Symmetry: D8
Subunit: 55 residues, 16 copies
């Protein structure tokens, strides 16, 4: 189930991620990245381009 | 400007990310992660909890 | 049945303030309410429909 | 105080949480509860009752 | 018929609703809340998922 | 604390909610309904008219 | 059965109804109650519970 | 206090079916619910704002 | 408070009005006309042209 | 095609109607009443209670 | 100036207008044009360009 | 083809101001634009669907 | 006045609009498109950012 | 290709769009307007009525 | 002025199909349209407002 | 064919792109153009014209 990767987010988006961990809304940097991916995943699923690429 | 990190996304979300690179909508895995973070960033900014934590 | 979770201190403070407001009786009630929101959001999600 | 919490979910809500972990979108049971707590937090913040 | 632990802020909310005069009894307020919850439950995407 | 006349269809609705397991007690269901009603009341334009 | 109904509104709801009649948008107390009943009827018809 | 209104037969049948469903206890409860909807709609209306 | 008028609605809209009285949702033809006027009144009030004509 | 009726609108709604004729948006009182009925007709058609009464 | 206007609608738009009159919802061709002018007036008033 | 209509003075003033703004070339162009709005609104209307 | 390269599919679109009879000339169609673009531009949040 | 009477306010609007630098030529602006009009036309309920 | 970008093959195919449809004249026109969408989305974004 | 493209943006659109890169949300000019192309792609896919 586990799987790591190393990404370049850049400094500003890294600071965004650390701020979210600092707030305690998320436990780890990975959790923040996963929440962002889940959000992008929900947007991809319901996108008209996914509905188009299906038919 | 550049800044890397290593995250655990897990297998299923990693497969989601690779599918987006495979589609050619994105060039790299980092680009996908950055797009997800930008999306989470826009949601955080306009969230009523950011407006509340401000005042 | 019971689940042991790491909420962190800040989210615990959020949970406890919901309890002291009186709108919830217990910490577990607040969590069940949060899980009901997520269950409804998950079920109605476009990704829910796509996976089926 | 504690960063750890033991919650009476009942078997059905527990089965819901374990399913999201099985689906691989969440890594741990804890991550699922935090996601639902974040939803509730945003809702209570933007509630007209909070205003 | 039914006895429920509301806590006293929720009791105050209900009594305030009766004091406004939009409601006649405490029981009317609880029925209204449950009708609200019943409508939300029925229209839930998760109730659509379970009994489409 | 509070005793309310729900009628028995409303009782069945509540018990069905407890039977689903999204809720632990009948009291939790009524609290949830009242939180729903409390949020709607507070956000009412009429509550904005009375206490803008 | 009856086309007539006697309703316990309480003084505040009664004051609301008499105000709409005073405002001239409604002619009678009855017209106000029918307007509110029409609202409830449309809501219950289009309720997901009605589906 | 009590008001005597002409609802007509069909709207009475609507009121009574709401009562037999059990979601409401009395005919007067159904009417108060209808008047609460209209009060909220009136208060939030653009014509409400214009008149003040 | 009372005030009558005689209007030409035409046949089709008259049939619409009578159908609404027949349904019992309304007691009289006047009630139907008044409900229609209240609806047109609420639309006029919140119309951007009423907001414009004000300033 | 033509068809008259005499309605009691009351004073306040009559003043509303005359104001709309005075503005020149409508030529006659009948036109105002007809516009109100068309509006109520469109609302009735798409109402869930018309969809329910159909099935 | 004039309360009367002669408009080049073309046959298709004219057929649209005569149809609304045939349907009985409008009494005259003029009433139809005023209804469309009222729509345009509301749109131009509430246009962000008008702000 | 041509239609002779009674617009009244005020609506004529509205039509003519649209022409002097330059967004429309002729009085008839403004009217055709108004009729296009009404045609689209009519076609999409719930009463359009009901009649068919 | 103005000469523009539309390409011939866009020319066909315009001529089709004139053929429907909702429009009288090709120029009317282009004016309508530019009014559409003018309204969108004015209401743009970016036009609000530049000239709030 | 196509020559159109825009009037000079509409010409100014187009040239202003080219002056902003979001657009390169006057022709690009007109194409953009026609794409806007083409999308609105296609999605029209009246285009759904004619070619559902 | 000119910018050299890595679009990848698939997005190029998307750009070129937009050009062959005739709705756009050049590959650069398609890109400017994409950048106008992003500029408008950026300017209106809640994060735009927060940063100022 | 080419994965590379040279685009006439003009200085203003170029300044817009370089600004998003300066803001650190995007790493490269290319990433910005792909983001805008993704927006256009979703819009054209879900266009009623595409249906």
């Amino acid at each position: 189930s586990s799987r790591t990767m190393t990404v370049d987010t850049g400094e500003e988006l890294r600071a965004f991620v650390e701020g979210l961990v600092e707030s305690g809304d998320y436990k780890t940097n990975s959790e923040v990245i996963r929440d962002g991916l889940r959000l992008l995943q929900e947007k991809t699923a319901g996108s008209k381009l996914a509905a188009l690429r299906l038919e």
